[PDB]
């Protein structure tokens, strides 16, 4: 429940007058009345002053201005009649979907007045569907009953009706009230239904229930039950009304969050949905160098952010100047918010047609600021990636690292993360090769030197960054890097070096805490 | 009667509730999608068909040394006849 | 890492699964919905909007039509499908 | 039979991919029960060949492998009898 958060801030961050402040302070009273409205709107709670809401089934037995206003706003834009018509149309469509097998000749809705969907005094028939045969009129009983009793009565035209009710705390007995309504409509003075064997349905909109205790046609009671269940599950107008009621009562369920990418969903990020594995943990940079005497050099370094797309083999590095992070008179939360805002602005700089459909963030706490900064652009899903990829190896590169150190200006220059696998190898294979290269670089220096350029005559392309290699050279380099990574894992764990399953090895490389 | 118990009824089950099924034709192409309509001659009309197949660069370097890739295309609404269709299988 | 094998449907299904691309007496086979005449399944909010438009007997305006057309065109373009320029400029 | 639904698809812009890789896209004007697609002002692109635009074409239903309809095709109202 949104405690004092139904509106933006109830106009509290403003300079309104005293009357507006009093209205805002009295707004929670309306919500409190609405929440406990069924217990208070009962005709046995107040005196008999039955008043029905205009063009609606809300029969407010009393005069509560707060609850009356809340109910009127809940049913805004002529919701009751539209909901009744939508329910009738949904029932007719559900019937006509397989009406031929159920011995139905022609289904058509009768000419019912708009005031005949809210006036309980006078009723009518909703569906007038022919059967093309002598449909034995079964005894009018509750649909909840499992007894198969049919009196000796047959006819051709069978009718079906639907009613809308807003039951109170005591008026929630949908079955009994519906049976009584059907019985009264059978001998009604003015509700002249065409077929005496015309069933009637009821909807307990207030209590989210539905029932029908009319003449269930042979073989149609399961059909009516299934139609009612499907409607109550996903009735469009009813769903809209429920959403409006939830909004009015300052109630909103905690929406499910994006799942984490485990060792089984590791390769799921290579689909057509663009994913930018944002990992800017190394953004913070400083000298932290022990000077000879007196103090230590407290010189911040020019930071940067990491944005790479293994789903497309891209690499875009936005460098954060140390001047921006020094002397701004703020804490680290402001810096994190600024970083998230910069990421959102760089996403906005990218075209909407090229907007990353998913935004995998390595930083756990950076998802909420990312969603807040770019809530106007919700086409990107902030999915979790628990296994942190070694994307910080760019900061240790001869070219990328030196640039990041000296990039005093915010540059959105792009780069190719894959050396040549973008147009040579598979996208998943390219991501695996990039992961292996980054792991080798993070493992050590000399081992990374052997892995990257085993031959002094073999180096990266002049227009590229990562060392270009063919299939055989890449295989040899990856074998050496895997051996080095196994040695590092054995040293860190004090266990056998090559004793991990292929899935386990992949999870360890991805960064899972195995 | 016999329309929901034949081998075609298996294809019917593949689209029984607009379920997703993949059909492999004679041209080594796999079209995956939800079948909207069928017929007696296996004329399957589906919507949003993803066609995945094997593609080759066809000697892009000049020595015929290349690897086949998974070429993937999207179609809004397709109507594949039962002549070129070889097999079909529903998604588990 | 499974390529598309020729004359085989199991490889494409495995790649789609790895990529994440996947009374008379009877039971009712009823599944109703509200899909627009163009075939697109209208959202519940969009379905309610269409139902309210039908009830009120009034449709979208000129600006609403333009916004809908732009959104539909953008969605279609996205559903249809800068690395080379960044590699050449580097 | 799905041939009756394709016979009622006249004056509609659709494509047909043949068994030899030739895809012909155009406005279909006539279709019999044997899928004899007679279209006007179409363009056919063969396999590893240049596309050619013709004012009239008559593609047979035997060599036609697959079809392609746009998102403005009312398949929910044309597949009924």
């Amino acid at each position: 429940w949104e405690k004092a958060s139904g509106f933006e801030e109830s106009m509290k961050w403003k300079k309104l007058t005293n009357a507006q402040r009093s209205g805002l302070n009295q707004i929670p009273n309306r919500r409190f009345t609405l929440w406990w409205s069924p217990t208070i709107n009962r005709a046995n709670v107040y005196v008999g002053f039955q008043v029905q809401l205009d063009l609606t089934g809300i029969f407010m037995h009393g005069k509560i201005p707060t609850l009356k206003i809340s109910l009127i706003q809940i049913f805004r834009a002529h919701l009751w009649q539209k909901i009744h018509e939508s329910i009738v149309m949904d029932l007719c469509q559900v019937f006509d979907q397989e009406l031929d097998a159920l011995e139905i000749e022609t289904v058509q809705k009768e000419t019912i007045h708009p005031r005949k969907s809210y006036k309980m005094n006078s009723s009518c028939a909703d569906i007038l569907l022919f059967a093309s045969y002598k449909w034995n009129v079964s005894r009018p009983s509750l649909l909840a009953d499992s007894k198969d009793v049919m009196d000796s009565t047959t006819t051709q035209k069978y009718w079906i009706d639907i009613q809308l009710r807003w039951g109170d705390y005591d008026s929630h007995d949908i079955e009994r009230y519906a049976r009584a309504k059907f019985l009264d409509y059978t001998t009604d003075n003015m509700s002249i239904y065409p077929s005496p064997t015309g069933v009637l349905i009821a909807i307990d909109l207030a209590y989210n229930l539905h029932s029908a205790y009319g003449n269930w046609f042979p073989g149609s009671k399961p059909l009516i039950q299934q139609a009612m269940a499907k409607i109550m599950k996903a009735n469009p107008a009813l769903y809209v009304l429920r959403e409006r009621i939830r909004k009015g009562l300052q109630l909103y369920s905690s929406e499910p969050t994006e799942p984490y990418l485990s060792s089984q969903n590791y390769g799921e990020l290579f689909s057509n949905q663009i994913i930018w594995f944002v990992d800017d943990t190394n953004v913070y940079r400083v000298t932290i160098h022990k000077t000879f005497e007196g103090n230590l050099t407290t010189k911040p370094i020019n930071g940067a952010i990491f944005i790479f797309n293994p789903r497309t083999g891209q690499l875009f590095l936005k460098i954060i100047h140390t001047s921006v992070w020094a002397g701004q008179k703020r804490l680290g939360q402001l810096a994190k918010w600024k970083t998230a805002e910069e990421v959102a602005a760089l996403i906005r700089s990218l075209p909407v047609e090229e907007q990353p459909k998913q935004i995998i963030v390595t930083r756990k706490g950076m998802l909420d600021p990312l969603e807040v900064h770019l809530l106007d652009f919700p086409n990107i899903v902030i999915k979790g990636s628990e296994l942190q990829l070694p994307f910080q190896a760019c900061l240790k590169v001869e070219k990328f690292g030196d640039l990041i150190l000296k990039a005093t200006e915010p540059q959105m220059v792009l780069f190719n993360l894959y050396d040549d696998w973008l147009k040579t190898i598979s996208s998943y294979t390219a991501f695996s090769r990039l992961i292996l290269i980054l792991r080798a670089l993070h493992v050590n220096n000399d081992r990374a030197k052997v892995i990257l350029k085993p031959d002094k005559t073999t180096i990266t392309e002049p227009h590229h960054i990562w060392p270009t290699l063919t299939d055989e050279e890449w295989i040899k380099v990856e074998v050496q890097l895997k051996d080095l990574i196994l040695a590092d894992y054995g040293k860190k764990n004090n266990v056998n070096v090559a004793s991990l399953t292929q899935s386990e090895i992949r999870d360890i490389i991805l960064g899972m805490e195995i | 009667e016999e329309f929901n118990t034949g081998p075609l009824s298996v294809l019917t089950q593949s689209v029984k509730n607009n379920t997703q099924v993949l059909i492999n034709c004679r041209n080594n192409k796999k079209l995956l999608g939800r079948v909207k309509a069928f017929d007696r001659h296996c004329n399957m009309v589906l919507e949003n068909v993803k066609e995945m197949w094997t593609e080759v660069p066809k000697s892009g370097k000049g020595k015929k040394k290349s690897k086949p890739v998974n070429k993937d295309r999207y179609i809004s609404k397709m109507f594949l006849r039962g002549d070129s269709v070889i097999v079909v299988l529903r998604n588990p | 890492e499974e390529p598309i094998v020729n004359r085989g449907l199991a490889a494409a299904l495995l790649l789609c699964q790895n990529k994440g691309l996947l009374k008379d007496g009877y039971k009712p086979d009823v599944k109703i919905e509200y899909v627009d005449e163009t075939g697109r399944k209208l959202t519940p909010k969009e379905a309610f909007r269409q139902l309210s438009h039908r009830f009120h007997g009034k449709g979208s305006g000129k600006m609403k039509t333009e916004r809908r057309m732009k959104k539909l065109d953008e969605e279609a373009l996205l559903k249809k499908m800068l690395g080379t320029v960044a590699l050449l400029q580097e | 039979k799905l041939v009756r639904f394709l016979m009622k698809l006249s004056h509609e812009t659709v494509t047909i991919e043949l068994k030899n890789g030739t895809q012909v896209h155009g406005t279909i004007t006539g279709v019999d029960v044997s899928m004899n697609t007679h279209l006007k002002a179409v363009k056919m692109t063969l396999k590893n060949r240049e596309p050619v635009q013709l004012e009239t074409l008559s593609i047979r239903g035997n060599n036609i492998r697959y079809f392609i309809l746009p998102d403005s095709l009312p398949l929910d109202t044309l597949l009924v009898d």
Binding site: - | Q13, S14, A37 | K58 | -
Partner: peptide, 26 residues
């Protein structure tokens, strides 16, 4: 014959701005 399907446009009956009579038409 496998599985085929089709849906009729559910055109909801006009309720407001009818500019006609009281009872809903057929």
């Amino acid at each position: 014959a496998y599985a085929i399907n089709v849906s009729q446009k559910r055109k909801y009956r006009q309720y407001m701005n009818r500019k006609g009579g009281f009872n809903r038409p057929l």
